[PDB]
Design a protein around this ligand. Structure first.
Ligand SMILES: CCNC(=O)c1nnn(-c2cc(C(C)C)c(O)cc2O)c1-c1ccc(CNCC2CCCCC2)cc1
Length: 211
């Protein structure tokens, strides 16, 4: 019930600027990066389940779901990956923004393609192209469920979460910007998944809204 607040102990500003000046014309990249993040976490639980199958006591189905919500202007991406402990959450959303931005900027000068963003540990922040705010709910076997949240300003919060428990994995909720509601369209999400994520080795399921 207690909220901790962290300062972006680098320039998340530098990262955000790089991302605008690199993908603002092709915002749809965010879905590719988020889906790819899920796949990595999914690989991790799969791998770990081999040495020790009780790892899957928290859930057997290894998959990714997309869930637009036009009423709430949210697009949510759920996976049953290995999830994140507190430390992993901070590490992956804080510590690695710093070193990852740096590493990526250096490679971009040396001439690397922008499509490499994922490999430098910062693909998640491409969500700030479409979303004013992002919430990340996550659960790892070796820890409690946590909610991370940030508007990409100078800070993010981490709190123990108390809403519906997932058993293992990560849900990213994007509160879209007024002008970016197109990513709530079934047709659009379809194009994107086909265009970017056809070779993801796990089922990606779009949950269509009734209307
Ligand atoms: C301690 C082990 N747990 C995890 O690794 C994990 N668990 N869930 N996720 C995860 C994270 C995100 C972002 C919020 C960071 C996500 O959108 C979906 C996820 O499943 C992650 C996760 C953590 C980090 C990353 C980023 N990997 C970038 C890396 C860079 C070097 C090349 C290979 C790939 C992707 C997913």
């Amino acid at each position: 019930e207690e909220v901790e607040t962290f300062a972006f102990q680098a320039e998340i500003a530098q990262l955000m600027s790089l991302i605008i000046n690199t993908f603002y014309s092709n915002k749809e990249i965010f879905l590719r990066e988020l889906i790819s993040n899920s796949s990595d976490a999914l690989d991790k639980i799969r791998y770990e389940s081999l040495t020790d199958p009780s790892k899957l006591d928290s859930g057997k189905e290894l998959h990714i779901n997309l869930i637009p919500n036009k009423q709430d202007r949210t697009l949510t991406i759920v996976d049953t990956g290995i999830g994140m402990t507190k430390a992993d959450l901070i590490n992956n959303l804080g510590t690695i923004a710093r070193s990852g931005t740096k590493a990526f900027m250096e490679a971009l000068q040396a001439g690397a393609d922008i499509s490499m963003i994922g490999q430098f540990g910062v693909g998640f922040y491409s969500a700030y192209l479409v979303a004013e705010k992002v919430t990340v709910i996550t659960k790892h076997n070796d820890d409690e469920q946590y909610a991370w949240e940030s508007s990409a300003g100078g800070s993010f919060t981490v709190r123990t979460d108390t809403g519906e428990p997932m058993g293992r994995g990560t849900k990213v909720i994007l509160h879209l910007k007024e002008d970016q509601t197109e990513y709530l369209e079934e047709r659009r999400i379809k194009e994107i998944v086909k265009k970017h994520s056809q070779f993801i080795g796990y089922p990606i399921t779009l949950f269509v809204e009734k209307e």
